[PDB]
């Protein structure tokens, strides 16, 4: 067996792909695989055929997985696959997941490899939420053919509970406290299932059965073997592995409103704070500091769950969150005080958890001065640092943090700098929110008839700010508008040339070399062109937000400065209010769901349907 | 609520106490000011008072209840001695 | 041929590994932008036309 095993499998995946009938291998491989899980389910089989078959099937469901994806007068592609024959392959996997004891624990690692492969399978290829994709009223997504994919993650959800909770139970038991592998393979799998999972059956057995709380005890056993691989050279790189799959999965279940609040329950954010390994910041086999930045990647991600569907009832997050910053203040003013993608990002998630969380209506009630004072302390320095970024970024500094990534800008580089602007937009106008919400909540101090005006470097203990920064930073937003719109008008340009280009540029890019093939240049020319258009449609949203929010700052900011005694507008107003609106213009949008319609509940309802149309 | 927490607020309560005792709050009746001195953690009034904590023990854990709330496993040796 | 084996489940496992990578990465970033933008936007069009 092990003898035939081999050569077979060998042989179909390394033989160079002549394989003119694709449906036929497919076939084939199906007759396989059905063969073999006959043969092993029988009571009376042997043991040695277990280890063998399971590899087989593994394998043979890894083939097929990049077979149905490149298989993905017009029903010749899926009349072979079958989705019954993929539900009775499933159930043939699965009843030979179970029969498995824990013995042998290579088998049940080899069968959630060929699980997860089979679920990538149905996933839908993800399509960037393009402006465009705005313009689908929610009628035609209520009244459009049913999605195949759709129906199969049903049917499978109902598979995974056919077995009820014992198979969960099991596979989550393996994933928690398992071996290298096998814990990676399924934590992903893991990952994949609650990612699939919308009736959350897999998650409230997870809560419930104290899973859940386990995974997130298992990240305490870390500060001993993280602080070793800080070492330059690190005996095992699995440990890193199995932490960010850990990692994804903890990411996935934040997605969902339930699974932060049940994440914020089991305290995740408590153990987090309690982590000495964010404060070991080494002083400047990936690299060391490249291990630290990583390390802070997941722990920062994760905790930006509260800014998803945790809507203000999860508000203690923002505490939560705020005591999580605090604890490691230095690692904190350390990375705000440090010009790279990775660092942006981490400013943009910083400075958004700083806005809604450092509200001083948290102050009061955490009374029940000490912490009065530390937040207070907390809330002068972002405000100090939050200021040192227009000097930073609306100054001089700008051309040189643009040219010395021009050295090497490739699409990378493209989109790097795109991902700076974003940067840039994010925590300015996150911290421009904050500002406007103390000037709200405060009534911005009514009280401060008390002259505002006068008649006329590390984090020390005290430092003042000024207030011409907001006139420099209302100069260099006012530039920054004709900017970025201008290279918004120039992508836009760019995305009609790449829409001008239909099947027949198809066949006049093969044309060249007709007598990597072809029409696989031509699908990874698709692949690049849809990159493309991911990074111009992303371009377009930053722009108008960047647009509508230098607009109404600027709007406020004058409306004020009008009282106190002071003492190419047409173009660009030309090419945003009236050009974008009625571009974009599904303005007064979809009324046939609303035309067929427990008033103030429902009401906020389809207001927020109202928002999923937008979004 | 974390450990960090717990502990500031532990201590914004010990320095009211100290500000209390400061005061001369309980200077009348000795035993309050007593008490407070112990809520301070002065291990003099503890050991005055080694008649109610019969046992080395019961003063260690007092001790701890008042000086280090958050005390490691590893620390407990120390103390102990 | 035990290289060619041990080659072909190395490449299985760094499949699964871009996997994952690319939901978590791709989701949370782009969740956030989504969410403030939804957010700001219905929150200084609701302003505006109450401040009026």
Same mark, same amino acid.
Request: aromatic fraction near 8%; glycine fraction near 4%.
């Given at each position: 067996?092990?003898?035939?095993?081999?050569?077979?499998? =060998?042989?179909?995946?390394?033989?160079?792909?002549?394989?003119?009938?694709?449906?036929?291998?497919?076939?084939?491989?199906?007759?396989?695989?059905?063969?073999?899980?006959?043969?092993?389910?029988?009571?009376?089989?042997?043991?040695?055929?277990?280890?063998?078959?399971?590899?087989?099937?593994?394998?043979?469901?890894?083939?097929?997985?990049?077979?149905?994806?490149?298989?993905?007068?017009?029903?010749?592609?899926?009349?072979?696959?079958?989705?019954?024959?993929?539900?009775?392959?499933?159930?043939?996997?699965?009843?030979?997941?179970?029969k498995?004891?824990? @013995?042998?624990?290579?088998?049940?690692?080899?069968?959630?490899?060929?699980?997860?492969?089979?679920?990538?399978?149905?996933?839908?290829?993800?399509?960037?939420?393009?402006?465009?994709?705005?313009?689908?009223?929610?009628?035609?997504?209520?009244?459009?053919?049913?999605?195949?994919?759709?129906?199969?993650?049903?049917?499978?959800?109902?598979?995974?509970?056919?077995?009820?909770?014992?198979?969960?139970?099991?596979?989550?038991?393996?994933?928690?406290?398992?071996?290298?592998?096998?814990?990676?393979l399924?934590?992903?799998?893991?990952?994949?299932?609650?990612?699939?999972?919308?009736?959350?059956?897999?998650?409230?057995?997870?809560?419930?059965?104290?899973?859940?709380?386990?995974?997130?005890?298992?990240?305490?056993?870390?500060?001993?073997?993280?602080?070793n691989?800080?070492?330059?050279?690190?005996?095992?790189?699995?440990?890193?592995?199995?932490?960010?799959?850990?990692?994804?999965?903890?990411?996935?279940?934040?997605?969902?409103?339930? @699974?932060?609040?049940?994440?914020?329950?089991?305290?995740?954010?408590?153990?987090?704070?309690?982590?000495q390994?964010?404060?070991?910041?080494?002083?400047?086999?990936?690299?060391?500091?490249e291990?630290?930045?990583?390390?802070?990647?997941?722990?920062?991600?994760?905790?930006?769950?509260?800014?998803?569907?945790?809507?203000?009832?999860?508000?203690?997050?923002?505490?939560?969150?705020?005591?999580?910053?605090?604890?490691?203040?230095?690692?904190?003013?350390?990375?705000?005080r440090?010009?790279?993608?990775?660092?942006?990002?981490?400013?943009?998630?910083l400075?958004?958890? =700083?806005?809604?969380?450092?509200?001083?209506?948290?102050?009061?009630?955490?009374?029940?001065d000490?912490?009065?004072?530390?937040?207070?302390?907390?809330? @002068?320095?972002?405000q100090?640092?939050?200021?040192?970024?227009?000097?930073?970024?609306?100054?001089?500094?700008?051309?040189?943090?643009?040219?010395?990534?021009?050295?090497?800008?490739?699409?990378? @580089?493209?989109?790097?700098?795109?991902?700076?602007?974003?940067?840039?937009?994010?925590?300015?106008?996150?911290?421009?929110?904050?500002?406007?919400?103390?000037?709200?909540?405060?009534?911005?101090?009514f009280?401060?008839?008390?002259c505002?005006?006068?008649?006329s470097?590390?984090?020390?203990?005290?430092?003042?700010?000024?207030?011409?920064?907001?006139?420099?930073?209302?100069?260099?937003?006012?530039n920054?508008?004709?900017?970025?719109?201008?290279?918004?008008?120039?992508?836009?340009?760019?995305?009609?040339?790449?829409?001008?280009?239909?099947?027949?540029?198809?066949?006049?890019?093969?044309?060249?070399?007709?007598?990597?093939?072809?029409?696989?240049?031509?699908?990874?020319?698709?692949?690049?062109?849809?990159?493309?258009?991911?990074?111009?449609?992303?371009?377009?949203?930053?722009?108008?937000?960047?647009?509508?929010?230098?607009?109404?700052?600027?709007?406020?900011?004058?409306?004020?400065?009008?009282?106190?005694?002071?003492?190419?507008?047409?173009?660009?107003?030309?090419?945003?209010?009236?050009?974008?609106?009625?571009?974009?213009?599904?303005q007064?949008?979809?009324?046939?769901?609303?035309?067929?319609?427990?008033?103030?509940?429902?009401?906020?309802?389809?207001?927020?349907?109202?928002?999923?149309?937008?979004? | 609520?974390?450990?960090?927490?717990?502990?500031?607020?532990?201590? !914004?309560?010990?320095?009211?106490?100290?500000? !209390?005792?400061?005061?001369?709050?309980?200077?009348?009746?000795?035993?309050?000011?007593?008490?407070?001195?112990?809520?301070?953690?002065?291990?003099?009034?503890?050991?005055?008072?080694?008649?109610?904590?019969?046992?080395?023990? !019961?003063?260690?854990?007092?001790?701890?209840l008042?000086? !280090?709330?958050?005390?490691?496993?590893?620390?407990?040796?120390?103390?102990?001695? | 041929?035990?290289?060619?084996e041990?080659?072909?489940?190395?490449?299985?496992?760094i499949?699964?590994?871009?996997?994952?990578?690319?939901?978590?990465?791709?989701?949370?970033?782009?969740?956030?932008?989504?969410?403030?933008?939804?957010?700001?936007?219905?929150?200084?069009?609701?302003?505006?036309?109450?401040?009026?």
């Open positions: 067996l092990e003898s035939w095993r081999q050569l077979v499998e =060998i042989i179909l995946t390394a033989c160079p792909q002549d394989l003119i009938p694709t449906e036929h291998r497919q076939l084939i491989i199906r007759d396989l695989l059905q063969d073999l899980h006959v043969k092993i389910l029988d009571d009376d089989a042997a043991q040695e055929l277990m280890p063998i078959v399971a590899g087989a099937v593994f394998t043979l469901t890894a083939h097929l997985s990049q077979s149905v994806r490149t298989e993905l007068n017009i029903s010749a592609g899926f009349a072979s696959i079958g989705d019954s024959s993929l539900h009775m392959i499933l159930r043939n996997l699965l009843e030979f997941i179970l498995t004891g824990g @013995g042998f624990q290579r088998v049940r690692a080899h069968l959630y490899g060929s699980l997860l492969y089979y679920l990538q399978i149905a996933q839908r290829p993800d399509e960037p939420d393009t402006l465009e994709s705005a313009h689908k009223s929610m009628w035609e997504r209520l009244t459009a053919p049913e999605d195949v994919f759709s129906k199969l993650q049903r049917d499978n959800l109902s598979i995974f509970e056919s077995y009820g909770t014992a198979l969960m139970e099991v596979v989550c038991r393996d994933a928690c406290d398992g071996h290298d592998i096998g814990r990676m399924a934590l992903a799998l893991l990952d994949r299932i609650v990612s699939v999972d919308r009736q959350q059956q897999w998650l409230l057995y997870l809560s419930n059965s104290g899973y859940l709380k386990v995974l997130v005890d298992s990240l305490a056993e870390d500060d001993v073997v993280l602080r691989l800080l070492t330059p050279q690190p005996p095992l790189l699995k440990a890193l592995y199995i932490y960010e799959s850990k990692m994804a999965f903890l990411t996935r279940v934040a997605k969902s409103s339930q @699974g932060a609040i049940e994440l914020l329950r089991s305290g995740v954010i408590v153990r987090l704070a309690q982590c390994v964010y404060d070991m910041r080494p002083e400047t086999i990936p690299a060391p500091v291990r630290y930045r990583q390390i802070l990647l997941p722990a920062l991600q994760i905790c930006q769950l509260i800014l998803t569907s945790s809507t203000a009832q999860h508000l203690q997050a923002a505490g939560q969150v705020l005591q999580f910053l605090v604890a490691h203040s230095d690692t904190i003013q350390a990375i705000l440090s010009g790279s993608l990775g660092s942006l990002q981490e400013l943009a998630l400075t958004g958890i =700083i806005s809604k969380a450092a509200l001083p209506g948290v102050l009061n009630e955490l009374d029940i000490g912490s009065m004072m530390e937040l207070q302390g907390h809330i @002068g320095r972002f100090r640092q939050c200021l040192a970024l227009l000097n930073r970024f609306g100054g001089s500094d700008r051309l040189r943090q643009l040219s010395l990534q021009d050295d090497s800008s490739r699409l990378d @580089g493209v989109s790097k700098k795109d991902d700076m602007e974003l940067a840039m937009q994010q925590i300015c106008s996150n911290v421009m929110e904050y500002c406007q919400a103390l000037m709200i909540q405060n009534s911005p101090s009280q401060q008839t008390v505002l005006f006068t008649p470097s590390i984090l020390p203990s005290w430092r003042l700010p000024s207030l011409g920064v907001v006139i420099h930073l209302l100069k260099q937003s006012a920054n508008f004709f900017t970025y719109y201008d290279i918004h008008r120039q992508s836009v340009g760019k995305l009609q040339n790449v829409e001008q280009l239909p099947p027949d540029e198809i066949k006049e890019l093969c044309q060249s070399e007709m007598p990597i093939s072809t029409t696989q240049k031509y699908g990874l020319a698709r692949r690049r062109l849809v990159k493309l258009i991911n990074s111009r449609a992303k371009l377009l949203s930053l722009c108008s937000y960047i647009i509508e929010t230098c607009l109404y700052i600027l709007w406020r900011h004058l409306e004020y400065y009008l009282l106190h005694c002071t003492t190419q507008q047409d173009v660009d107003t030309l090419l945003r209010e009236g050009a974008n609106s009625f571009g974009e213009s599904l007064k949008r979809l009324l046939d769901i609303e035309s067929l319609y427990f008033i103030q509940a429902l009401v906020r309802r389809i207001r927020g349907l109202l928002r999923v149309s937008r979004v | 609520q974390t450990l960090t927490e717990f502990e500031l607020k532990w201590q !914004h309560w010990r320095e009211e106490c100290e500000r !209390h005792l400061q005061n001369g709050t309980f200077s009348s009746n000795v035993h309050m000011e007593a008490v407070c001195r112990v809520l301070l953690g002065d291990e003099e009034v503890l050991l005055e008072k080694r008649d109610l904590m019969t046992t080395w023990y !019961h003063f260690l854990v007092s001790r701890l008042f000086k !280090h709330p958050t005390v490691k496993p590893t620390e407990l040796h120390f103390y102990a001695q | 041929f035990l290289k060619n041990k080659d072909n489940a190395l490449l299985s496992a499949e699964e590994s871009r996997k994952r990578t690319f939901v978590m990465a791709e989701e949370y970033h782009r969740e956030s932008m989504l969410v403030e933008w939804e957010q700001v936007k219905q929150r200084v069009l609701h302003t505006l036309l109450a401040s009026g």
